[PDB]
């Protein structure tokens with residue numbers, strides 16, 4: 001049976017998830033939680049999911065962005081966001097760190113806050129150390145939209161959602177997505 005995505009207000013999404021014991025990573029148990037994430041992500045569809053969003057209070061994230069999803073976005077926005085496809089990534093106990101003080105500002109949404117968007121400022125360059133799905137120690141250097149999803153998913157594990165880190169006056173229904181920003185809202189884009 002496939003778990004449901006958990007909505008905002010459920011305390012599992014607002015409290016800090018706990019680390020997987022690295023000796024446990026390859027058990028049928030953590031493997032099932034992982035496979036469940038992957039399936040819930042591909043069903044939605046979305047580019048990223050964290051374990052708290054399926055009710056599991058653990059430090060686990062998955063992410064994928066496919067050529068197919070990407071060929072839906074305006075070709076010029078794909079270019080501003082630096083949005084490039086990348087194979088399915090699983091990380092257990094991810095620890096995120098920026099590689100520089102450069103930030104970008106664009107719209108994100110979250111499966112836990114259904115129907116809405118807001119502009120959120122992200123580090124453009126990250127590193128995430130952690131474990132892959134076989135208990136092996138990995139590091140991942142990420143920029144552009146990939147680094148965005150890493151930060152979004154990582155945020156979940158500390159009980160942080162984007163509605164609590166969005167630029168004022170940008171929150172909006174999906175349908176209002178393309179409406180103009182109000183005066184004194186910063187422009188979407190990035191640093192030189």
Ligand SMILES: [Zn+2]
Nearest residue numbers: 109110111152
């Ligand atoms: Zn989310």
